[PDB]
């Protein structure tokens, strides 16, 4: 069974009563107004909890279920408010007990309906500079930096590149005041990555799950045989799962052509083998088909492969 269901709020709100013939209003609009609170002469909603950004590295994600859909607060004292019968905003008659003891995992959960979405941890500029110095100056391998700071290796390399770009931009005075204010207000919104904590440091033993293993296979053997990861790897015809981590932690003859004055291009001839080189004859044409191959040029132009 299914009907159209206007997405009314799941929490109580005061609905319209008798309306002046010319109001022309909807209950959804009133629900939004109550959620937002009064709008300033400046076009601002100071009374709404979520109007302003946090500043203490504790994200201010929505909690419509814990707080019963009461999103209003005093902007200066931050104390909860409620809409009284007379159309004013005052203290709640009773205090909420679900808004003080909030599980620390819930504070990093952007969406109330998805427990598996959590925000990442921002790295402090000091840690990023430390990693950049370690990788570039002291020449420490990315594996041991990853282990020391508990960061996945691609993230470490990305940090190195991003810090290099930042260094260039700072040497050129391209980081304007607006950019610095934006960066620092964004940085104070998210939790800060802590190298020392065990539960805040990234797991460093992850490997992709290939299709080959995903199928469950079972072996019946004598009751006392040992059967370890290496035997399992042999059975599935794969490298053992430890060499996968080990390998993830880490000729053709060519002839360049004679250029002469006035010639606008050079020829390089790469050696190939007959029966493997060429455009095949009677190959599948997909240009009129839904999976036609689209690629991008070295200049970023969309081309048809």
């Amino acid at each position: 069974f299914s009907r159209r269901r206007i997405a009314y709020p799941f929490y109580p709100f005061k609905k319209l009563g008798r309306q002046h013939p010319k109001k022309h209003d909807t209950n959804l609009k009133t629900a939004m107004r109550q959620f937002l609170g009064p709008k300033n002469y400046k076009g601002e909603y100071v009374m709404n909890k979520y109007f302003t950004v946090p500043t203490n590295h504790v994200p201010n994600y929505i909690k419509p279920d814990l707080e019963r859909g009461q999103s209003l607060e005093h902007p200066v004292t931050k104390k909860p408010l409620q809409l009284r019968y007379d159309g004013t905003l005052g203290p709640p008659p009773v205090e909420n007990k679900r808004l003080q003891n909030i599980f620390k995992d819930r504070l990093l959960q952007p969406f109330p309906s998805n427990p598996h979405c959590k925000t990442n941890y921002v790295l402090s500029p000091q840690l990023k500079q430390s990693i950049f110095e370690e990788i570039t100056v002291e020449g420490l391998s990315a594996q041991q930096v990853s282990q020391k700071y508990g960061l996945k290796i691609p993230r470490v390399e990305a940090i190195v590149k991003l810090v290099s770009v930042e260094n260039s931009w700072n040497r050129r005075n391209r980081v304007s005041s607006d950019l610095k204010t934006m960066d620092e207000t964004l940085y104070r919104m998210f939790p800060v990555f802590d190298s020392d904590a065990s539960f805040k440091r990234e797991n460093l033993s992850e490997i992709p799950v290939p299709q080959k293993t995903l199928a469950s296979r079972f072996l019946t053997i004598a009751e006392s045989e040992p059967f370890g990861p290496v035997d399992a790897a042999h059975v599935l015809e794969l490298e053992p799962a430890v060499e996968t981590l080990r390998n993830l932690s880490t000729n053709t003859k060519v002839i360049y052509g004679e250029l002469v004055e006035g010639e606008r291009s050079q020829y390089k001839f790469t050696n190939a083998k007959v029966g493997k080189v060429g455009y095949r004859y009677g190959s599948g044409n997909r240009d009129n088909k839904k999976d036609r191959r689209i690629g991008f040029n070295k200049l970023g132009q969309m081309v048809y492969i």
Partner: protein, 53 residues
């Protein structure tokens, strides 16, 4: 044309040599594996046997 003819000759003879080596290397790897599945495993003491019958 001489280069092509003689390189083809050389490639054929080299292929034959390589195939003989491959055959005699497989004939050893296979026998090593069959024998390594003959080292008495201690766990085989738990498989019931009726050798006399």
């Amino acid at each position: 044309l001489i280069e092509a003819f003689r390189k083809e000759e050389a490639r054929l003879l080299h292929k034959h040599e390589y195939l003989q080596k491959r055959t005699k290397e497989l004939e050893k790897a296979k026998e090593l594996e069959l024998e390594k599945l003959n080292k008495e495993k201690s766990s085989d003491l738990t498989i019931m046997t009726l050798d006399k019958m």
